[PDB]
Structure formats: C-alpha cells, structure tokens
Design an enzyme around this catalytic site. Sequence first.
Site, short mmCIF file in Angstrom:
data_model
loop_
_atom_site.label_atom_id
_atom_site.label_comp_id
_atom_site.label_asym_id
_atom_site.label_seq_id
_atom_site.Cartn_x
_atom_site.Cartn_y
_atom_site.Cartn_z
N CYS A 112 0.82 -1.09 0.04
CA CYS A 112 0.00 0.04 0.05
C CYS A 112 0.86 1.13 0.02
O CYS A 112 0.58 2.35 -0.78
CB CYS A 112 -1.09 0.04 1.10
N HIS A 147 -2.22 5.77 4.62
CA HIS A 147 -0.63 6.06 4.66
C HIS A 147 -0.51 7.22 3.94
O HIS A 147 -0.93 7.50 3.10
CB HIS A 147 -0.17 4.97 3.78
#
Lengths: 359, 359, 359, 359
Positions: free
Chosen positions: A153, A249
């Site tokens: 990710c 993130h």
Amino acid sequence: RPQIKVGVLGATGTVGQRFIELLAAHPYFALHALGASSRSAGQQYARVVRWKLPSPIPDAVRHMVVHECRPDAPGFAECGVVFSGLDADVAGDIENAFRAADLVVYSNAKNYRRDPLCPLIVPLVNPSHLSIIPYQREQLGLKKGYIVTNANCSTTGIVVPLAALEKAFGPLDTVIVTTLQAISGAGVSSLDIMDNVVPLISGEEDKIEWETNKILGGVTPDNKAFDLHAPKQINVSATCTRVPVIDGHTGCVSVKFARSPPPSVAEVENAFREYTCDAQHLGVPSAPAQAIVVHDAPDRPQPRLDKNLHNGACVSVGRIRECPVFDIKFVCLIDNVRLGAATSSIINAEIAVEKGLIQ
Amino acid sequence: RPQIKVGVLGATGTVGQRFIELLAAHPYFALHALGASSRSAGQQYARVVRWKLPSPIPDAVRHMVVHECRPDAPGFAECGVVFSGLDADVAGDIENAFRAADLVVYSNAKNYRRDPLCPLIVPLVNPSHLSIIPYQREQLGLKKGYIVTNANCSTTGIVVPLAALEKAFGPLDTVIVTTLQAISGAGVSSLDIMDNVVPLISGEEDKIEWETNKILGGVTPDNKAFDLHAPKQINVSATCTRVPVIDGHTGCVSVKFARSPPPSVAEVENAFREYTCDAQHLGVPSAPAQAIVVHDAPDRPQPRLDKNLHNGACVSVGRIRECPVFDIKFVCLIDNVRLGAATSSIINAEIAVEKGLIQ
Amino acid sequence: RPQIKVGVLGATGTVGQRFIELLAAHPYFALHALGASSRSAGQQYARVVRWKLPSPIPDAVRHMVVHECRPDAPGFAECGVVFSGLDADVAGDIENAFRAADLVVYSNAKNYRRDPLCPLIVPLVNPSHLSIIPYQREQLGLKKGYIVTNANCSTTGIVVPLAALEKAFGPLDTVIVTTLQAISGAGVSSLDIMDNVVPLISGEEDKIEWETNKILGGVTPDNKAFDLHAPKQINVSATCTRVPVIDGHTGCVSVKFARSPPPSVAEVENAFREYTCDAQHLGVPSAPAQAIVVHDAPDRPQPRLDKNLHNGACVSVGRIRECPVFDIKFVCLIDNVRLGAATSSIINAEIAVEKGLIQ
Amino acid sequence: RPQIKVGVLGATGTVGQRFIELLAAHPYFALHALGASSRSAGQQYARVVRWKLPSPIPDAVRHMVVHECRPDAPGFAECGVVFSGLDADVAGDIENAFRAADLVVYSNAKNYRRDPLCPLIVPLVNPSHLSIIPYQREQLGLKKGYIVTNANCSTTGIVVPLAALEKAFGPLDTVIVTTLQAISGAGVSSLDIMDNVVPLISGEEDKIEWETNKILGGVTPDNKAFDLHAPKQINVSATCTRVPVIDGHTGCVSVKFARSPPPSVAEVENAFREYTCDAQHLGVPSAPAQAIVVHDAPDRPQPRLDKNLHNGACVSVGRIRECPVFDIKFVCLIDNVRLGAATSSIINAEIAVEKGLIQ
C-alpha cells in the site's frame, strides 16, 4: 457474465477475509476454494475464522470448508485464478507449487516481486506489464499458469501520483519521500506505537526505492524483460515511519522533473485531476471512476478525514507547491482499506480477464 | 553570581509556568516581577494560575502578586532581564514597550525574529550573534535595553544537528526535512489529531526555511548585520506535520554538503558525538553536558522512549546512513519538554550574563 | 406532514450546526429562523459560521441570515418549534423569553431540567411526560408556549437500558455506574486527554444521579407533577470519566431489582432485544427501527467497532452477567454521534407533533 | 549486605526482562541463574532475547548463559530465591518442581494463588501472611523450599486503599469497582485498542473478586490457614476494562463499611495519608517512603500526570466523596511501571530476607 471459479489462499488471515468479502459481491469471480493452515483444514470457514471485519461473514462462504494450501486440494484444480493473502514466511513454496501445477496466482507476498519474469503491478499504473506473461509461461514449460505480484500500500500511494506526473510531463529525475504509515499495514503492538513514532519499518525504504523503477518502467519491446526505467532510472530516496493511526498512509513527496521548464502548481493540479489509466479505459468493474482526488484545502489530505472518498477514489493529494530544492512537492494519501491488497489484486485479475490471460 | 532580578511576562500561561519553575531553582536569576492579564493583575500567582505542571508551585512565588504587562508596573524597572512567554497576538507592542523603557527582553514570539538588529539564537548553536547587540542599542538610542528572540523547538531540533555538521564538514548546500511534531508544540484539539495526521502547521515550514540561514549564518565583521549564510545560502525545503504524540518532535533529514567528497557514516556519527558549543565551553549552569546523543539502534530515536536522556542531553539522532540522492540522511529528535522555550531562553540569558550584556 | 417552520438558537455553535444539518434533511420541519450572537446578526450563515462538520453546509441555509436570539427577531414569531443549542451561561434568560412570548422551546441546557413543570425527556423512554404540558401552559398564562428539555448523551446511554429493564421486570432498587466517555461530548484539548484518563467531568455524575429518577419516574394521575419515581426512588451512584476515544460513551452498570427473584441472564437479554418504545410505535421519522442491540460476543460492545449499527440502532449492551453484589451487571454503549443532542431534541419534537402539542 | 544469589525463570519474557533490569541494580540480590526455553538453553542472554525495554541490556547479564527451567540446571541449586515470570500454561509443574527440590519460589502465575498453604502477598498490605510458611514446609516435608505468589497490578491498585480503610475503620462489607487499565503488563495489539475501549480482560474480574478476601484477610491463630476474611467476607463486584493508555491503572471504587456510622470524607483522607505498612517499618530497600498519596484537586489522579510521584509513592487516590448508595466512593491509581510484577515480587522477597525465610 459467465462465472470464473476462484481460490483464496490465507483465507482466515485479514487480507484473506477482505478477498472473501469482495469476491462474494463480485459480478463474475465466484468463490470456489479456500486455503488456510493445517490446523484449520477440514473445518468450516465460519467456525475457524476470527472475523475482524465490520460487516458479517457472507452466506456463500459460511459453510465452505477450508482445505490445505496445495494445488490438488479440493476445488483448486478448477480455479481460473487463485488469490494469495499469505505471509512471506510460507508464501514462496506454496505459490510456486500452484504455478507449477499450471494454475494462475495473484500474490501479495514479497517473494516474486523482483523475479525477472513476474510482473509487479499497481493496477492504476502498469497493467501493460502483463505483456511479459507468455514469456513467463514459455520459460517454465507452462501453458496456463503464472504469477503476478501486487504491490504494497505505501508503494502504491506514492507511485500512482508519480505515474500521473510522468504521463503528463515526462520522466522523473529525482524523488524524495517521507512516509507516515498507519498500523493497518502489518502486527504492531500497542506498546511499540502508542504516543510514539517508530522511525523504521524494516525493508520498506528499500521496497519503495527499488520497486518504483520497476513499476514506472516498461517491458522491453521483445516482451521478455522489464527495463526497470533504464537507461535513465529515477533516483528515489525514502524514509518510512510508523505513526499511531489506524488507517491511511500519508506520504510527503518532493519531485524533480527531467524536463525543463518544470510545470507550475496549476499544471500539476490538473495533471492529477485528469489522470486516467488503462484499467478505467478497459472499464473493469472494480476500477474507480476517479483515480486521484486533488484537495484544495491547505490542510488536506488527512488520513482520518479523507477515507471513503466519492467516485470510488483511493489516492488523493494536497499541499501542491514549489520546492526550493527540486521542482514540486506535495502530500499524498492512500486509503489502504479501500485500495488494499485484496482490491488491488482483484483489479489486476479483472484486467487479465480482459486480455485473455484468464478463462 | 550575585542574584539578578528577573521578570516573566505571560506568567500564568504554560511557557510562563515553566519559566517560573526553572527560575525558582536557578543559582542566580531571582524571580522578581510577574506579568499576566488585566483580569489577573493584583492577585497572587497561586490563586489565578491553572498550574498544569507535574511538580507543585514553588514557595518563592506562591504569594507573589501578578501585575499588568507594562515596563512601569511594580518590579519591572529593576529587572535585569525580562523573559517573555507571550503569544504573538499581543507580544509585539508589549515587548517593544519594555525595550523602549530600556529593559532587556528574551522573547519567544515570532514578532522580532527577522528584525535585522535582533539576534535569533539557538543557545547550542549561535550565541556569538550577541555581537550585534551594541549596534541594536545604539540604533534605538538605548544604553541598556534590547531584544533577543529564542527559536521554536522544531527549528531547534533541526539546526542543532545541522550546526554540528557545518562545524565538522563545512557549509551545507541543500537540506530536505519532514517533521513529525508532537502536540506540546501549541492548542490542538483532540478531535483534530486523534487517530490522525494533520499535514499543515501554518507558518512552520516557512520558519524552518528562513530561520535556518539566519541561525547557521554569521554576523558581519562590523557587527551591524546578519549575513544570513550568504552568498551561498543553504537550500532548505520542509514539510511539517502534526502527529498524535504528546512530547518529542521527530525530524527526517537529508543533507547535501558543499564540499566534496562527503563524509562517511562513521565520520558523521563522530561529528555528532563530539559536538560541543560556546555555551558548554562557558560552563553556563543550564547547558547540558552532552549536546547531541547518537543512537546506535537501527529503530531509534523514538520520542516516547528517548526523552530525559543522560547528561542532560536534549537532541539526539539515529539512522545515519547514505542517501542515494544527497549525501547523508538521518532522523533527529528534540525533547521539547527539557529543551523547551523556557530552557532555551534561560540558557541564552546565562550566556549574555557571561558576556556582560546583563548586570 | 405539512411543513412546520422551525428556529435554531445557537446556530453557529456545534450543536446548532448539527440541528441545521438534520433539519435541512427533515421531511417536514423547515429551517426558518436562525439565532446567533449580536456580532453575527444580519450576516449570512455561510459567512459567519466556522463549519466543523464532515459534510458541507446545506443549500437551504447557505444564504439564510442569522438574527439576534430574541422571540421578536425576524422569523421567530412564526416558528412552530424553536430548537436551542445554547450554553447554560446564556440559555436561561433567552429560553424563558421565547417561552414568555408564547413560543415552543426544545432546550439542551441544564437550566430547566429540574423545573417541576418542565419535562426532561429521553425520547426512547419517557415521551409520555408530555402529559404535563397543558398544566405548564395554564400555570404560565400561556396558550401555545412551553419548554421541554432534552437529556444529554451519557444519561441517555444509561437510562435507555434501565427503562427496558423496568418495563420488563418492574422498578429498580439500586444502580451503580462508571462511565468512560468519548471526547465528541464537547472541545477537550489533546493535551488534557491523550494517553490519559480524566476522572472528572464536572456536573455529569450529579446529572445522572438526579435525572435518572425524573426520567424513569412518571407524571402524577392529575398531570400536574412529576413523581420522581417516588415513594421508592432508585438509588444511583455514578463516577464519570473521560477517555481518549473520539466517539462512543461506554457504561459499566450494576443493577439491583426491587422484585425477587431477579431475572436470569437470558431473560435480561430478551428484555433488551424486544424493547420498543412510544416513539417507535408512533412511527416518528427520526426514531430508529431497533432501540437496543444485544451483543453476544464476550468482549463487546466496543465504541470503535459498534458505531453505525444496523436498523438505525443507537444503544447497545453486552457482557450481561450475574453481579455477586447486586443482581445483574453489564456494559452499554451509546453512539453519541448518531444519538446526540440535536437528534434527541428533534425526535422529542416529532413526538409532540404527533400528540398535537405543535401545529 | 552479603550477596544472595538469585534465579529468574522466564528470563527472555517481558516480566523476566524487568526482573533482570531491577536485580542487576539491586543492593544484595545477585543475578546467578537464568531460565528460558529448551530452544534457547546454552546460548547467551544477549543473543536470544528480543529486548523490549527502553534502556539497554545490563553488562552483568549480556554474557550470562540461559539454561533449561529445572532446579538441577546450572546455578539454580545455589540460588537463595528463584523469581518466576512464567505464563500459567507452563508455570505450575515447573514452580512445583523447584519447590520440591527444596528451593524458594516467588511466582507471578495464577497457579498457586488460591492454594491453601501458599500466601498471596501484596507487599504493602499482607506480608504478615509469611507466618504460614513453616506449616507449608512441614506439610511438604521440606526444610527450606516454598512458594509465595505475588498479586497482579490491578488487584494491587485496589486492595492497597482498601487495606488502609480496614486498618483505620474496621472491616468492609461491600465493594464495587470499575477499572480502566493501561496496556503495560499484558500482549495488546494496537488494532485492538487505539481510539477504543475493550470491556473484557479475561480472568481479571474473577481475580479481583476472589483475591481481595484472601489478601485483606488474615492467617488463623494456629498459622496453618488463611481465614479468607471469614466469617464475614467482603462482597466484591468488578468490571475491568482496557483503555488506550500506556501506563497507569485507574479504579473507580465504592465502599460500604461494616461499622456505623461511616467515617467522614476528612477522616477517609487522613486514613489514606497516614497509612504505613510492615514493609516500610522494616525499611526494605525497594519499599516506598510514602504508601498512598491523596490528591486534593477535584480532577485527580490522572495516569499520565501522576506517575513517578515523590517519595517513591506508587498508589494514589482522589475524588473522595459520599456515595448515595454505599458510604464512600473514590478514584485510585496505581503506577504499574514503578509497582509492577517484578517490583512487587522483589519487595516480597526483601521482606522474607528480613524475617529469615531466605539466607
């Protein structure tokens, strides 16, 4: 419209659960074969899984029986694609066994990412790298089977914006990035992270640094190799940190373009807004309508606020501004829940269906 | 050594509280005049303050009476130095009024930081900039009074390591930094920050980018101006973020040196370990025995773990390693509780005492 | 069903904002008159409000003008109900002025909660207490106006389960409760709460301890008074704490029943599952389909996992088990975002519409 | 003054690591024998341990060799006391083997806590229960060996204040308690706990409920049995929760006294302030100077603010006030870092040294 039977390895793990949730709801992939540990084999999914997802276990799978993770276990030989949510400790031998038995494997482990015949695909960037699959088959004496790896990710959250920049303004020279990674990543003990920052995530910087050139690069005109963005490779330097955040993130990115003059802020904003990729052009079902969202507010994106965006959007950027050192800097965010490992692997598979790499 | 009477403006505020704690314990500075709002004036400190510090209110001040924040309020005209923990909204006119009345002011507000006659001093880096004070006095028609500004904690946490690099390896060319700043900074509402990252702290990047060159620069040989590290100014690009951490500002820094070849990792480690500054050489009481701690563990420093270091150490660094793009990159940490605004201002004042700029 | 014009006092405040969001979406209550400070009066809502909610300002109100908080300001005299999100410091005189001018007021302030003519209603428990309104009117020489006060979220999260117990098993003798309250309450500064617990929320215990007997009590057969659950009042003792959680108030409750023998665990589970209240029976639009959810998992409810339940459910309970000291203990949770002040007040008003207390 | 050689079982586990940290610094206990798994045996501590503590591994132990956990492994037969930080799954047989080989064992497992010959000691409350040790030895045909179990932190944080109440006002009738337990001492994954409350800690309520009577009770006048606070046992009901806090277990407690009338708030405050125990009277090195701190502020204690109190104080209380249901209620806090499993066990051992139960 005609179903395609699929497998999920690591089905009781959190990634496996998500694969199961999404595939139960999928318009043509049909859950057919689940693999978990030797300890869980023979039990029904519902009774052995510790289901950690908001919504309940789907009906299609409640009473499905989990088997051992081998290609000759019940159901697997009929699967047109097998999805892997396995951890790297076990994934290598197993994924290789499935491929050797002439099955198709979409993996999330690190094991095959750098393999010179195995594409590493971020579905919103480089599905064209499927062109190397025939050569992978040929080299293994296989007619049907192969491996493709999905990227993680944090890498995805960075390379998507980079890809939009390359498409609009030509190759990148230099990229510097600092990440602030949520704990959904995987796990992290509360003692390690609460009221704290951990400035090391082992292997993570090296992944971003190496994988960025594979993913933004091409396949050689003969379709036998990856060029890794040669002859002129992007210089990437990362620092990766963990923060006490559940999901999202965040990346702080500075970019220098190879070409002169560099674009203005406004041109960069547009490049991001307008970006559209093969997966959207092919109209695969799991592709988002909007690839990148640009936030105009000076204090956005924020991981807790900018999850579950409109138009299925999964990557966003903000604070786009001049960098006194390079050309442009910005902040990017990836919703690693929506555009997690499962979603990415699925979109990859949908694209392989469109190209005739799956039945 | 003989006592020096001092003032504290903004005494009921958090910075003011810390000034009071430290000055009560101090070997020669004696709390003499407290300033707070018009609403608190005339009351005793103990009855108006919402004391937000672990340890209790000291004896010396429990029964001291707070006054209005003007230079002709009781006690202030006799103070040899007046410490300011005021917010920028009010600090400008007030600090100027004190200086105009021929008093010495050590400020933490932004108002005078870029003023061309007012030094901006990080006590472990550039106290030599006191050399411009006679010129400041002369230009204002003052015999005794002047203003010095203390830098904020995030700037300090970065420039201390930078200074050690410059002392050992000569001037810096380029610096890129991403910060992860704790909430002790100031405030931040729990709603804004819990389970989240806020990627903007207004004014903060611009401060780091500008102030770094003032602080690491010099004063001209005539002692009338700051050279701001000209002609070859450091190129600094910052992104500043807020994270859900109480104490400890973390910085992720990449550095390119002007001189070639650049130093090895081991040389950089030594430059940090060995760094000692004027304030330590003068032996001022509040200066630490160790200026910078180098952590050998690959996952350190961490804000929650590496507070209250040995030898009074306040800045640390770790993960020192090669940067594929620049020369060296690393992670730094400042304990903004131990080396907060109050501590920095005090150390600055101790140095001014050693140089005869205070009685 | 025909539209009913409504007012919102404290419209720029956070409660006011929520009132506005909900009433814009409401099937018959039509935003007609907004009240804010004398400083904001005459300006458009959009230009004065610091909108702190996820979704944007609704169209219906963008260009509405805010006025002073008095009953003879523009629009207010025509409102069929005026909702108050005012703080107690100012709410008393203002809410009384509105009532004195023959308007209907649904308040969230403390000022009228213990007034012996004013109902204090948790909409999922005691809307029957509207039966005292004609008497309130008669005593004030009013034909149309009155005040009803809405109870707060932590009280509501406790009393709803208590009510379900009383309906099924008769009156309660004794209740002990510890709360763990989220910060959405309102705000709390990160500094006060991160990595911490604050064991005081001023006024909160006292409210729970007094208000529970009013709310679970009745109105005398003459409809002129509250019996306050006399002669056998419930004995209630509370401790209320704040925890570092964004949404979700958790309560740890022990209960002793007046009647013997006490019910079994299973009987208590059923009482909670089956509980349905006047507001549901009346089918008011803002009432949930499910009043209390029972969790079977031994570690549930949890505020982060059990928000936005199905069927619009707002209160849940779990860990229902024997108490060695009293009869039964359990854990409860209220989604204070979904069932906040504004939602409760609106549901209260919807019920009054059904009973003909509003035009 | 002469050294006493000691053992640590479970030395690589987190409790074992703390035992090691503290015993390295101890004035007379000398680390002599470490026990860990069969997999680690024969290797040096430094090479097998995953050291999870802020400060580094001490010098004394870096090169010590871990052995199997049996009484006849190297070093163990010469140990005067063996400390156990083993998990209950393995601790029973092993601790019994050590005792059977005539060695002295201070355990933190559950296995022996309810054993009718084995004291369960909170060092600040009931070290007098060492009086049963000769009878334990006699019944097992042992001259030297025995087992004592240390209680856990949440139990300790409660029973210390209870003991002070019993000493000053006689036996307690009834106690109700809700705990808010920090994540230190176990583990808890960040996913389980961030921005959340987990209302179950398995086994924890049951422990508080059963153990409180053993600990606050006495030993029969013949020194052969625990009276478990009979004939009139304390009625205890607990709910235990986990909160996102690193250190500090908070308890919300209501108490009913057997005797009438009950004490006033002021009398209860004094009882707490004045409380002193055998361990302090004996002056053992690890005992604190102040056993219980009373906080006067209405919003205290708070786990983050009231750790590392003065005078080595480890337990504090606040918000002492009348309970409408019982007699008195309050809030308590234990610093479970300062007064953790390892510390409690060590203090227990120090007391046994003073009584001649160890050489």
